[PDB]
Amino acid sequence: VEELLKLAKAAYYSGTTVEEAYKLALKLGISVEELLKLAEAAYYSGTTVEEAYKLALKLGISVEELLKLAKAAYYSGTTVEEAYKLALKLG
Amino acid sequence: VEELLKLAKAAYYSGTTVEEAYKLALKLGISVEELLKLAEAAYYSGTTVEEAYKLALKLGISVEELLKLAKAAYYSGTTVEEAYKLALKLG
Amino acid sequence: VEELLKLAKAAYYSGTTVEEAYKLALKLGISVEELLKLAEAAYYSGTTVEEAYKLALKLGISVEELLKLAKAAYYSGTTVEEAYKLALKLG
């Protein structure tokens, strides 16, 4: 029932349903926790979940770091990529 | 004094007074913790506490599982029963 | 520096200054933690700190129990004494 609640939260974030979220979590071969993180991230950044996961592999990072980066980017008022580049520019 | 505070929180949730909550806790033969859980659940679902407990026996579950089901149902925009059926449907 | 902050919080709650709070803490022979608890309590109940402390002895309880009783009373919409009587009526 817990995973279901997580899925319901993710479905809330992505504006979709719970079944779609469930199939999407399988498609990307991930757990519901990672899916929820990616949901929060995608919501704070203003993109989709799949785009989020793709950017998460592109920059070669985990879902937590990506969520944190999406929050940070939301604060600073930029995209996640600009925020990563800024994270590296200062080392 | 702790149980009384629990009862006061439950009274906040259920919109009643503390004595009604106590007599209700006797009626259903439950503890103040279970009563408080059922209160939160009843708030998230939009039903009464007694209705909540009855649904908790109907579906043959605990108060905690019922609470989780009420949150899950609250996000997706359905009732607790639809949430139970969906909880079994996806395994 | 911490104890001073406790005194400043208590002074905020009781609407007085920090020196007054300190002297009140001396007068009643209590610690700044107990003073802060009694301050919060006094605010939730809508009385002074001294009234709160006197009520704490009247009912023969600790500062923690009194604070919990003040919270409970804040929720239920009654006095701390009525809440105590309700705490006894239900055992």
Add this chain to the structure above:
Amino acid sequence: VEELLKLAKAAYYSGTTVEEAYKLALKLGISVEELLKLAEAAYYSGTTVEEAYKLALKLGISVEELLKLAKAAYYSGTTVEEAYKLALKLG
């Protein structure tokens, strides 16, 4: 990404940007944690981060103690210096 988030919080608090915050952290030769602390302090006290740091050296104290003093001063309705003088006055 964590340090970047700290920098984003500090940049939010100080109303500046994140790069400006980092360069400010270089100027004063401090860490991002100290920078964020000095930011909070500066907000509760109503000064800049640099002013906060100068006041922090003036009194020969740490950033944490200064933060506590800024909170205390914010509550009591005084400046950080009067709060220090009060910190010594009461021993």
Add this chain to the structure above:
Amino acid sequence: VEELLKLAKAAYYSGTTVEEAYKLALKLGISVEELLKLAEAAYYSGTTVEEAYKLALKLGISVEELLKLAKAAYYSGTTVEEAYKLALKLG
């Protein structure tokens, strides 16, 4: 407006909304400061705010000590409990 800002920080940290944060502050009968502390703690530790609070009562400690333990645990790469056990082990 200040308490509201604290609630907004806590709501940002916990990834929820502000109203949810307030109702969460009622549920646990705590102040917004304690709520924010428990939020930070929950972030550094990787748990919920409620889980954080339960762990805070389990060990019979304050919210500040718990926050410090969550930071320590985040740095050292352990749980908050192992950090507590380490806090006692070294005396």
Add this chain to the structure above:
Amino acid sequence: VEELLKLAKAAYYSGTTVEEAYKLALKLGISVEELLKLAEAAYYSGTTVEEAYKLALKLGISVEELLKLAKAAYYSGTTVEEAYKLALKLG
């Protein structure tokens, strides 16, 4: 030269020039500090400075409280008015 720098910051925020900012600060009969606060606020909220000042009188508050409310609203993802109403609803 300080007031001029403040005016340059405000002109940065409002996307206008320094002379316009100066005449605008006179028009509203305010100091440059209040103007800068209103600039930050108007930027975080996505409105003009005059609209900001008008909302600041409408709700009968100061410039600092309004800036804090604009930041909070920026975090929560709502307008300043909804944030004020939420600030009152919970008391």
Add this chain to the structure above:
Amino acid sequence: VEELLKLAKAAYYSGTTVEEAYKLALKLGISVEELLKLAEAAYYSGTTVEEAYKLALKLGISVEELLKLAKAAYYSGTTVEEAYKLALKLG
């Protein structure tokens, strides 16, 4: 060791080494603090340190006023001289 650190920060700002900075500090007969201020200024304005000091004598001002003028000019998007003329124009 402090002055050396100031010199190292100044060396960061001016992009040179520490010895060049020291000999430059002798050349202009100034202290390391003034040198550091002039470094920051030179960075914000996009000129050299010597150019900065020469402009500081040209306009007959201190290093601090020149720094403030460089920031002010940096926001509005003009040179320090335009900023001086504008500083006098508005009184």
Add this chain to the structure above:
Amino acid sequence: VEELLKLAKAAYYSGTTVEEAYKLALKLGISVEELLKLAEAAYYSGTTVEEAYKLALKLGISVEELLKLAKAAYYSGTTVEEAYKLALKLG
């Protein structure tokens, strides 16, 4: 709980565990503050904590001066010893 956190930070910096850091703090007969300073220093210099502490005696200075020298060296791009020699060359 604070001293434990200092030890955890130092353990982060030195890449070891907290117990190792504690035993190192005993071996060298120093406080956790000095240990943390020496940790930061050792990180900025790219050596171990013991090397840093030995270098602190070699040059006959305090932990603060050594940390400042490590920062300076980090900026200028040299070793702590070369930075010390530069600190003496300029008097």
